A paper describes a structure:
Crystal structures of [name]-luteolin and TTRV30M-luteolin complexes were determined at 1.12 and 1.7 Å resolution, respectively, S1 Table. The [name]-luteolin complexes were co-crystallized with five molar excess of inhibitor in the space group P21212 and contains one dimer in the asymmetric unit. The TTRV30M-luteolin tetramer is structurally very similar to [name]-luteolin, and shows the same orientation of luteolin at the TBS, S1 Fig. High-resolution crystal structures of native [name] and mutant TTRV30M in complex with luteolin show that luteolin is arranged with the A-ring buried within the core of the TBS, in agreement with the results of our in vitro activity assay. We also show that the luteolin molecule binds to the TBS with its aromatic A-ring buried within the TBS and the B-ring facing the solvent. This mode of interaction is likely to be representative of the entire group of flavonoids and explains how bulky modifications of the hydroxyl group located in position 7 of the luteolin scaffold will impair its effect. Flies expressing the mutated TTRV30M display an impaired neurological phenotype that resembles the clinical manifestations of [name]-associated amyloidosis in humans similarly to the published model with [name] V14N/V16E.
Author numbering:
A (entry chain A), B (entry chain B), C (entry chain B), D (entry chain A): 10 to 125
Amino acid sequence: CPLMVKVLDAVRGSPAINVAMHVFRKAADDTWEPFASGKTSESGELHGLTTEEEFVEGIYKVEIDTKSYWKALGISPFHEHAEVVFTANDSGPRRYTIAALLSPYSYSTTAVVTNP
Amino acid sequence: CPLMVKVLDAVRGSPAINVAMHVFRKAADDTWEPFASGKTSESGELHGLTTEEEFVEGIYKVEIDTKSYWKALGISPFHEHAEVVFTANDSGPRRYTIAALLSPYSYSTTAVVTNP
Amino acid sequence: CPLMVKVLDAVRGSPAINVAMHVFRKAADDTWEPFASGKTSESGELHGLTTEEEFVEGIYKVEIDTKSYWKALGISPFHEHAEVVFTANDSGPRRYTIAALLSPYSYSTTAVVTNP
Amino acid sequence: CPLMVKVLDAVRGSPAINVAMHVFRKAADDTWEPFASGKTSESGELHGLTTEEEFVEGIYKVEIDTKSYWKALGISPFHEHAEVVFTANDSGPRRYTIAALLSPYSYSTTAVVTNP
Ligand SMILES: O=c1cc(-c2ccc(O)c(O)c2)oc2cc(O)cc(O)c12
Ligand SMILES: O=c1cc(-c2ccc(O)c(O)c2)oc2cc(O)cc(O)c12
Ligand code: NA
Ligand code: NA
């Protein structure tokens, strides 16, 4: 799998567990088509979202459901969700790790892109 | 004005100048309706997007064109844009500052919500 | 004044108020010499630390007492303090803004260096 | 080993390789005594710094030599180094991962603390 998402909680100093996320891919008509979805494990990681064959060139959006995460912990956060939108595999297959660090009124996201 | 956006450049240690952005408001059919837009000033700030009477409660999205910013500097970035999606809530303070800190493969965003 | 520090709270989405900090300048024997200090205002800002003629080139450290901040809010933090260590360089712009964004188990710091 | 450090480069979207760091521990007389040191691998991680036996209670400082990292890449950065100062093992043995995300004029650091 060439796409992994890792999420950390900056309040607890822990992986962000059970964070839902939905991945979309832009279609030829400019709409967002559902691509994959899942939730983070005890390690705060989400593996196995897709395959090298399936993960073709395109513009992808990872919607990380941060609001639901905070509310489940009894906290009212600012953002609805964190979105990460990027072109993938423009120059051939790459492996992408999307990392996100969450606080109730702030988040950071970074990408590590490697060539297998 | 109850909404201001400030953008900083983490590579150069400066305001991010001439950064374009569009703000959308979510409609009842779940589509994104254009609301306001503009470009950051020399101070990296965009003021005057809206007024108190216009900025009613609801879900807003600020789509910051970070890709065009980096490309105009001759740097290849990861993200298509940075998105900040949030609910405006009258039960909270009245002034919203959305800040974003940009790197080519990462960004961070924070909300500072205060009362005059 | 060529040096300002601004501190934000990522849990509450607000300026970090009454945050104490000390600035040190590195001496020839590599010890840290007290230089200036103060507490952030209602806007999370500390102005007036130094003057142009006093702020000569050299290595400075800003030690922000983040632990006391979180404890006064009843929150257990990870770090003893946040440190920002940098060289003041006359070949660059004249005004330094050191910003810090605080969470209990994480912080971020950025420098915005500009010319009037 | 109960202490690991991971460093990412926000400009390249890659692990930060060959980053040197020195770890210190506060002595009874309030000086910083050398504790351990090493450099990040191809994965941007530094493992094996210490042992459960050696890593006793205390106040630790991880100095991550970011300036040397950027200069080796022909970039003049703002900070001398990123410091992470924290009390460890206050409530019995824990495992600590210190993560840092680097840009030339900005960095973020976070801690993941787990109970084995
Ligand atoms: O250090 C940060 C500082 C700021 C910031 C916000 C308002 C200002 O008037 C300013 O001078 C800096 O905004 C941020 C916004 C972020 O999303 C992440 C950050 O680390 C910062
Ligand atoms: O997005 C971030 C991602 C990471 C990170 C990435 C991979 C890991 O295996 C890990 O354990 C942490 O670490 C950070 C550390 C930071 O201080 C700020 C950040 O935004 C991140
Ligand atoms: Na191509
Ligand atoms: Na104890």
